[PDB]
Design a protein around this ligand. Structure first.
Ligand SMILES: [Cl-]
Ligand SMILES: [Cl-]
Length: 162
């Protein structure tokens, strides 16, 4: 298992513009287009991202290209973030994938906000960190996905994804 595979299971793949869990226009493998409630604004962001008149449909390849860019961005963002990098540096490979997934979903800023859980993860207090992460809107809104990432941090294994 690896990050790409993990996120692919979490986000799925849609080739047409769709609304995510929060009702925002998205395409591909969880690529957010815009938070504006206008479909036109979305189509325009879409063609701007792909570089062609898409009419709101992209191919698989185009989806995977946005995904590759998005994973790269996530990692980079983490490494650039003063709160995040030290956490990432401290972790094992599997747990690093769990942090990336969170960053992919919520952005670097939202993650950086889980101060207390970050701290627990850095100290390697697994069971505690897992309880604290569960007290969040994140877990309450997308509980199955959150359980999966949480279990990953708790165990340092991919079992949640098996
Ligand atoms: Cl983009
Ligand atoms: Cl969920």
């Amino acid at each position: 298992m690896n990050i790409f595979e993990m996120l692919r299971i979490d986000e799925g793949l849609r080739l047409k513009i769709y609304k995510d869990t929060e009702g925002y226009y998205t395409i591909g493998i969880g690529h957010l287009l815009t938070k504006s409630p206008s479909l036109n604004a979305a189509k325009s962001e879409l063609d701007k991202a792909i570089g062609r008149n898409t009419n709101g449909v992209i191919t698989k390849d185009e989806a995977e290209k946005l995904f590759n860019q998005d994973v790269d961005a996530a990692v980079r963002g983490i490494l650039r973030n003063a709160k995040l990098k030290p956490v990432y540096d401290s972790l094992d490979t599997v747990r690093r994938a769990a942090l990336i997934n969170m960053v992919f979903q919520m952005g670097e800023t939202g993650v950086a906000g889980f101060t207390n859980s970050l701290r627990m993860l850095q100290q390697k207090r697994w069971d505690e960190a897992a309880v604290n992460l569960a007290k969040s809107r994140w877990y309450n809104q997308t509980p199955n996905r959150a359980k999966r990432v949480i279990t990953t941090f708790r165990t340092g294994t991919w079992d949640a994804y098996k």
